[PDB]
Amino acid sequence: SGAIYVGNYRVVNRHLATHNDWANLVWEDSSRDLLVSSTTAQGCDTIARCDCQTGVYYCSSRRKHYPVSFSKPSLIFVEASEYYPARYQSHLMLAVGHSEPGDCGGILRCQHGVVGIVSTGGNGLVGFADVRDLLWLDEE
């Protein structure tokens, strides 16, 4: 579980979006496992605008923050799960690290802010859905 709160926006894993997220839908992309809903409250989070390939992510299954190196956002083959068929996921960054299902929504950050959220795991890898291209999260 987890969300990014920036301005009047909530960023969640599309596959973990609640009924209220869909009732307040701003934008979603199945290929990215992302959904953005609108919030009454002002969010704190700054979105990184950078090409950092190092950062720290929260792993809820270990209650720990891990430093990681991660690949640039890419089209990545992701095995079938409960939520999606075996498919290519866009805007995904892979690192060596621990990720179990309930780790999704864990934040990855660099010195510049939030880079993305845990979206995938297994085989000793963690996948992060990048949000750094979503410039519109910073206005309106």
Ligand X SMILES: c1ccc(-c2ccncc2)cc1
The two structure tokens encoding residue 10: 């909530």
Stretch that binds Zn ion, among 25-33, 39-47, 51-59, 74-82 (CB under 5 A): 51-59
58 contacts ligand X (rule: CB under 6 A): yes
For the purposes of burial, counting CB atoms within 10 Å of the CB of 70, is it exposed (0-12), middle (13-18) or buried (19 or more)? Answer: buried
Q: Is 107 in the site for ligand X (CB under 6 A)?
A: yes
How many angstroms separate the most distant Cα atoms in the chain?
40
Q: Tell me if residue 59 is catalytic.
A: no
Active-site choice (21, 45, 59, 104) = 104
50 binds, among Zn ion, ligand X, none (CB under 5 to 8 A by kind): Zn ion
Sequence letter at residue 16: L
Q: Phi then psi for 92, rounded to 5 degrees? A: -110, 135
Asked if 109 is part of the footprint of ligand X (rule: CB under 6 A), the reply reads yes
Q: Is 33 a catalytic residue?
A: yes
Distances (CA, A) of 21 to 2, 9, 26, 45, 63: 13, 10, 9, 18, 26
**Minimum distance, C-beta of residue 12 to ligand X, in the bound complex (Å):** 13
Flag whether 44 is marked binding.
Answer: no
Tokens of 129: 């859905």
Among 1, 61, 111, 136, binds ligand X (CB under 6 A): 111
Q: Which are the catalytic amino acids?
A: 15, 33, 104
**Residues binding ligand X (CB under 6 A):** 52, 54-58, 65, 107, 109-111
Binding-site entries for Zn(2+): 50, 52, 110, 112
